[PDB]
Every structure is written in C-alpha cells, then in structure tokens.
Design an enzyme around this catalytic site. Structure first.
Site, PDB file in Angstrom:
ATOM      1  N   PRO A 267       0.811  -1.240   0.000  1.00 41.76           N
ATOM      2  CG  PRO A 267      -0.247  -1.111   2.085  1.00 41.76           C
ATOM      3  CD  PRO A 267       0.388  -2.111   1.111  1.00 41.76           C
ATOM      4  CD  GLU A 268       3.761   2.291  -3.882  1.00 40.13           C
ATOM      5  OE1 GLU A 268       4.398   1.257  -4.188  1.00 40.13           O
ATOM      6  OE2 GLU A 268       3.847   3.344  -4.547  1.00 40.13           O
TER       7      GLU A 268
END
Ligand SMILES: [Zn+2]
Length: 264
Positions: free
Chosen positions: A1-2
DNA sequence: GTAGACCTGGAC
DNA sequence: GTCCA
DNA sequence: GTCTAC
C-alpha cells in the site's frame, strides 16, 4: 500500500467510525505498539474517547480522537475492517478497538510489520514518525524546484531518491517504477545526471500518476489501477508503447521493472 | 549500495 | 522442499 | 516497507 491505497482506505473508513466512542482495546501482538511502549498504557488512554476524524500524511493513517491522535503505518500486509463484536475474528487479527455500540475496528497484518504510535493532537506533527516527513505530492509544497534542490546534491540513483520519504511523501516501488517509465528515465541513473527538462517532466508524471491511481481506488497487486500499469510486474512481457520485452533487475536494493528502449 | 532483520503463506 | 515481496 | 550493519 502506497499513497493511493492508503488514501482510498481513508475515504472508505471514515464514515464507518466517525462519532463512535471507544470502550476497550485489545492487543494480541505487542511489538506492533511503538508508543507508549507499554501496550497496557496505550490501551487505557484511549478508553472513553470519541472518533472525531481521520486524515492522511504520506503513507500514514492519522486517527483523530478527543485529545489524542493515533498514527498507523500498514507496511506490507496491514489492513483494517469494521464489524459486529458478536462475530468471530478473521485470522491474523492483532489489534481490535471495541466501541460502545457493539461494533469494532479490526486490524490484520499477516507478516506483522505494521506500527502504531499515539500522542496528544498538537504533538503528533512534531514527533516521530511524522516529524521528518516531506511535502505532499498533490500539493503546492511539492514542485519541480523542490525536487531539484535534492537531486543536484547526491550520487545515488534517481529511484533511490524517490523512495525516500523525507524528499517527497507517499511514493513506493510500484509508483516510482511507473513514474520513471512515463518520464522516459532509467531508474538506475544518477539523480544529479538529470537535466532541468527531465526534472520538470518527472515532477509532472508523478503528479499525474498519483492522481490517476487515486481516482481508481488504487492497484490490486499481490481496486482497478493495476490494469493501467506499464512496467510493474510485467517481466518478459511486450511493452505497451514499443513492444520490447519488459526487463527486471535490481536497483537501490529493490526489484525494478523498466523498458530498455523507452527509458534512457 | 546490497544483503539481513522483522514474519508468513502461497508459488514452482 | 523452498524461493519471493 | 523500513531500518540497520559491513
Ligand atoms: Zn517501450
């Protein structure tokens, strides 16, 4: 996740917890709690507080309570979900917050890398891990200029410069490789070897990439943006613009995907 | 810079 | 059995 | 994803 994934989680979770009052907190894997160190103190200070809001800073979720702020980092597997306190927990659930209305917020993390900190609201931005954090990519704080100052001062690769959260907050392995492809710049190249025309170009592709991913609810790797990926996860596959097989090596200690003809 | 931690369950 | 992010 | 040790 970014940034795109964490920002999507933020918009989708807020209305499911706003206004709920915390009644109890349970920890099944202590190491996740970083401050206060004692997981029993962390649990007791939150009891009796009401969830007033939810924000984001780079890749961190920032829960806003009555007097405190809860700072959460998902690392590689961390995930949140709200449900009835009367149903069984999913496996790998390590931290749970119970609300006075019978519902609860559940945190899962298979590899156990995630972290959690909590401080009074006014102290959160002045202490780790949010303190030495760079500007937001989708804000005036980030510009072509603010990206050059840092590049014209180091031998390291350009990818190694973008992964660094103090330079700019929010970019990761997926969006760094995608951005460098859209800009036609090899990842392993020196940050100082970049012209002005390239800097501005790179700044523009990062903004347009992070923006697009958000409007599609992030990418599903390991959400519909993965259908718009150019290089990430496409080793030995024809490039979408020229047809050369995508390649995969190792830059800045991380897996790296790129096109040998399109990037240079 | 690039292994080596910190952990675990699907890949091949 | 074992290599990967 | 990040932090630390030759
Ligand atoms: Zn190409």
């Amino acid at each position: 996740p970014e940034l795109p994934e964490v920002e999507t989680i933020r918009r989708t979770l807020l209305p499911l917890i706003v206004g709920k009052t915390i009644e109890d907190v349970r920890i099944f894997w202590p190491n996740i709690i970083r401050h206060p160190r004692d997981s029993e103190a962390f649990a007791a200070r939150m009891i009796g507080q009401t969830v007033r809001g939810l924000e984001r800073r780079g890749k961190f979720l920032k829960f806003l309570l009555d007097r405190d702020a809860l700072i959460s980092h998902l690392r590689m597997e961390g995930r949140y979900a709200v449900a009835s306190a009367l149903e069984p927990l999913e496996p790998h659930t390590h931290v749970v917050f119970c609300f006075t209305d019978g519902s609860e917020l559940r945190y899962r993390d298979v590899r156990k890398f995630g972290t959690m900190h909590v401080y009074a609201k006014e102290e959160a931005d002045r202490r780790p891990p949010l303190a030495e954090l760079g500007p937001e990519p989708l804000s005036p704080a980030f510009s072509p200029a603010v990206l050059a100052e840092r590049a014209v001062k180091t031998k390291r690769s350009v990818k190694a410069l973008l992964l660094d959260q103090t330079v700019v907050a929010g970019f990761g392995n997926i969006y760094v490789d995608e951005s460098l492809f859209r800009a036609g710049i090899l990842p392993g190249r020196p940050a100082a070897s970049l012209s002005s025309k390239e800097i501005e170009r790179l700044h523009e592709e990062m903004v347009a990439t992070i923006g697009e991913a958000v409007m599609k609810g992030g990418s599903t790797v390991r959400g519909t943006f993965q259908h718009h990926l150019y290089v990430y996860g496409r080793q030995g596959n024809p490039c979408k613009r020229c047809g050369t097989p995508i390649e995969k090596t190792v830059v800045a200690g991380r897996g790296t995907h790129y096109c040998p003809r399109c990037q240079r």
